[PDB]
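2024-03-11 09:14:02 INFO worker-7 job=invfold-0412 stage=load source=structure_tokens
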């Protein structure tokens, strides 16, 4: 499913080389999120399967149609800083360890909720 592949491109990095602004600015460019600068974007780390599992076993309902993880994840949230959102895109990083909320379709993650 292309929506799942997009989710992984935008929101999955198994073993991050960093958790800092340097990491964010690199990752936002490498994952195609700087044309123009995406304002807020979270990367989830660790095992791919456990993220998928949020759609089923490792997850629970979360209104409206969203789902929250049963376990916490290491994450890195990249937040745009500077001025107007044209490259080169500058980011500040917030490393976290918490439960995440996603939207699922066909038992696959398609959407990451950035409301935290
Ligand atoms: Zn901005």
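2024-03-11 09:14:09 INFO worker-7 stage=emit residues=116
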């Amino acid at each position: 499913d292309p929506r799942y592949t997009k989710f992984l491109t935008q929101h999955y990095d198994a073993k991050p080389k960093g958790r800092d602004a340097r990491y964010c600015e690199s990752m936002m460019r490498r994952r195609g999120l700087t044309s123009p600068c995406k304002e807020v974007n979270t990367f989830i780390h660790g095992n791919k399967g456990s993220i998928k599992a949020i759609c089923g076993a490792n997850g629970s309902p979360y209104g409206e149609n969203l789902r929250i993880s049963q376990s916490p994840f290491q994450i890195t949230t990249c937040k745009h800083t500077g001025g107007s959102p044209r490259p080169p895109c500058r980011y500040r990083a917030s490393a976290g360890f918490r439960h995440v909320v996603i939207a699922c379709e066909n038992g696959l993650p398609v959407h990451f909720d950035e409301s935290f």
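2024-03-11 09:14:09 INFO worker-7 stage=report msg="The chain has three helices and seven strands."
2024-03-11 09:14:10 INFO worker-7 job finished
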